[PDB]
From a paper:
The transpeptidase domain harbors the active site with the three conserved motifs: S–X–X–K (Ser311′–Val312′–Val313′–Lys314′), which includes the catalytic serine, located at the N-terminus of α2; S–X–N/D (Ser366′–Val367′–Asp368′), which lies between α4 and α5; and K–T/S–G (Lys513′–Thr514′–Gly515′), located at the C-terminus of β3 (PBP2 numbering indicated with a prime symbol). It is of note that a disulfide bond lies in the proximity of the active site, linking β3 to α9; a similar positioning for a disulfide bond in SpoVD (PBP2) from B. subtilis was recently linked to regulation of catalytic activity. Notably, in the crystal structure of unbound, closed PBP2, hydrophobic zipper residues Phe71′, Tyr127′, and Tyr134′ are covered by the anchor region, indicating that binding to MreC requires uncovering of this apolar patch through the swaying movement. A structure-based sequence comparison of class B PBPs from rod-like bacteria using the closed form of H. pylori PBP2 indicates that residues that line the head/anchor interface display clear similarities among class B enzymes. In addition, in structures of unbound class B PBPs from both Gram-positive and Gram-negative bacteria, analogous hydrophobic patches are covered by their respective anchor regions. In order to further characterize the “opening” mechanism of the N-terminal region of PBP2, we generated a “disulfide locked” form of PBP2 by engineering two cysteine residues at sites Tyr134′ and Ala218′, predicted to be well-positioned to form a disulfide bond. This mutant was unable to bind MreC in conditions where wild-type PBP2 could generate a stable complex in gel filtration.
Penicillin-binding proteins (PBPs) catalyze the two last reactions in PG biosynthesis (GlcNAc-MurNAc polymerization and stem peptide cross-linking, or transpeptidation). Class A enzymes can catalyze both reactions, while class B PBPs act uniquely as transpeptidases. Within the elongasome of a variety of bacteria including E. coli, Caulobacter crescentus, Bacillus subtilis, and Helicobacter pylori, PBPs have been shown to interact with, and be recruited by, the essential protein MreC, a bitopic membrane protein that is essential for cell shape. PBP2 (residues L38–L588, thus lacking the TM helix) is a 588-residue molecule that presents the characteristic fold of class B PBPs, with an elongated N-terminal region followed by a transpeptidase domain that carries the stem peptide cross-linking site.
Author numbering: 45 to 520, 540 to 588
The structure:
């Protein structure tokens, strides 16, 4: 009756205990390391006769990896046999000289690509990891991206292993007992597997990102970066080829588009700019100015999204019909310092503070930044391009999401996955600003619900009342934003949707409606 230190790792579940990440128990077949080239092939022969399956080439190959996840110092793993298969042939395989069968509780992702950039994958700990370590983290198995890395310590458990017993008695079958577990390491995410699937359906041929947040605390119900990758491909430690084809896909599936990609926010920053206008200028939301197809400054002319122009327009209307010239005009009057302050406040400067390694911060172009990095001081027209969320203005979908959350509720939520991060709501806006958000919400409600709103024909057939804002980002065909909260009458959720080359905002409303309806259908509303 032999016992084994079986390497295991914690479970990752969705907000309803549905398994996002877990383990399956197998046997690894191992050979002694530093083995003679003549022995090796001979012992490989015996293994494939036991398990007529394994390709003589892939066993040799396996034995020769220099980044195996489960290798010992003096024995190397050549293959992964299911318990069903190993059971009958354990004893005779033990009996053969120089061959070992060791239980391994390896990673298994049941839903494959689902939430791949959220969950992330386990891998062999590298030399640059080890050389940089400041916490006596000497484990060969560690998380490499997303949650796996973020909570590696929690998920790895106390020592990284559990103790199992195998009884290949006089009997002809191997039983398997767990004598000591590795407990206190289940992690529970706020995701809803069911919603994440609807998100996966919505982006079936598309590229970009989608987030659905509880704006009262930060819980991310959905978080997709499309295209996703199939986490299982990384389980034994990624196949050198399988790695290539993930790196060479021109759609770039390794990138996290919701946390680690930048984009101009475009028209979506209009509420925030408008807030700055109200703070800093002798204006109310109801102040009405004329808004031709264009105005000019000196050398250049600044054009409205469409050439008809809009006639007269106040802030409600500007938001409603995404009027570029309103913002160009008052952009002339506002100070970039006072603008960029407003923008930073509502989130666009720094990180949202999400449970993922290396969240990206964007760029809020101000005047102290043009002088430092470049040389000339800030020109007036530069404000105007920033006022409509383009030029050197870059942001993540999370920043847009969090901004939307702030506009909806008055307080900045910290988007997170891990359910047990009490993430207290931050309050960056003052009483006057919170008061003035009221206008902005009505604005956003008009975009979705007033017949001239840009997303009116877009967002029809919605169970719950939506307040939304569409945008486009120019490319460094145009990226399309839609960002929203619901219900309008009493806001709880925020949704942010980015499609690369979706082009507009009145294709995306259909997606907002779809996800919004799937929420009501599953009783979140």
């Amino acid at each position: 009756k032999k016992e084994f230190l079986v390497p295991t790792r914690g479970n990752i579940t969705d907000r309803n205990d549905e398994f996002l990440a877990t383990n399956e128990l197998v046997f690894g077949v191992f050979l002694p390391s530093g083995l003679k080239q003549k022995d090796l092939l001979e012992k490989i022969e015996i293994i494939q006769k036991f398990f007529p399956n394994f390709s003589k080439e892939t066993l040799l190959n396996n034995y020769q990896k220099e980044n195996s996840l489960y290798n010992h110092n003096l024995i190397k793993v050549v293959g992964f046999i299911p318990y069903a298969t190993m059971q009958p042939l354990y004893a005779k395989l033990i009996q053969t000289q120089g061959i070992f069968a060791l239980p391994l509780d390896k990673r298994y992702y049941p839903n494959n690509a689902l939430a791949s950039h959220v969950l992330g994958y386990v891998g062999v700990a590298s030399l640059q990891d080890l050389k940089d370590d400041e916490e006596n983290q000497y484990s060969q198995i560690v998380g490499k991206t997303g949650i796996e890395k973020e909570y590696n310590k929690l998920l790895q458990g106390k020592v990284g292993y559990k103790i199992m017993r195998v009884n290949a008695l006089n009997q002809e079958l191997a039983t398997l007992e767990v004598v000591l577990p590795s407990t206190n390491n289940h992690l529970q995410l706020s995701l809803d597997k069911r919603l994440q699937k609807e998100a996966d359906k919505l982006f079936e041929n598309k590229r970009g990102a989608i987030l659905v947040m509880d704006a009262e605390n930060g819980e991310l119900l959905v978080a997709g970066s499309y295209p996703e990758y199939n986490l299982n491909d990384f389980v034994g430690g990624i196949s050198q080829d399988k790695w290539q084809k993930l790196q060479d896909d021109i759609y770039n599936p390794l990138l996290n588009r919701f946390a680690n990609a930048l984009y101009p926010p475009g028209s979506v920053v209009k509420m925030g700019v408008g807030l700055s206008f109200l703070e800093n200028l002798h204006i109310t939301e109801n102040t009405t100015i004329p808004t031709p197809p264009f105005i000019e400054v000196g050398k250049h002319k600044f054009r409205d999204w469409k050439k008809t122009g809009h006639g007269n327009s106040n802030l409600y209307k500007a938001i409603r019909e995404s009027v570029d010239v309103y913002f160009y005009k008052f952009g002339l009057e506002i100070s970039i310092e006072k603008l960029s302050k407003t923008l930073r406040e509502v989130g666009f400067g720094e990180k949202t503070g999400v449970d993922l390694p290396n969240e990206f911060v964007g760029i809020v172009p101000d005047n102290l930044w043009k002088l430092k990095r470049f040389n000339q001081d800030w020109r007036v027209g530069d404000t105007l391009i920033t006022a409509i969320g383009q030029g050197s203005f870059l942001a993540t979908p999370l920043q847009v999401l969090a901004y939307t959350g702030l506009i909806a509720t008055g307080k900045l939520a910290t988007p997170h996955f891990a359910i047990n991060n009490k993430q207290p709501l931050k309050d960056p806006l003052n009483s006057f600003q919170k008061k003035k958000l009221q206008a902005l919400r009505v604005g956003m409600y008009e975009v979705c619900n007033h017949k001239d709103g840009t997303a009116y024909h877009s967002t029809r057939g919605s169970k719950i009342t939506l307040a939304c804002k569409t945008g486009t980002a120019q490319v460094v065909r145009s990226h399309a934003w839609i960002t929203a909260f619901l219900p309008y009458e009493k806001p709880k959720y925020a949704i942010t949707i980015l499609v690369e080359h979706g082009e507009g905002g009145s294709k995306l409303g259909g997606l907002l409606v779809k996800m919004s309806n799937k929420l009501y259908e599953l009783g979140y509303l």
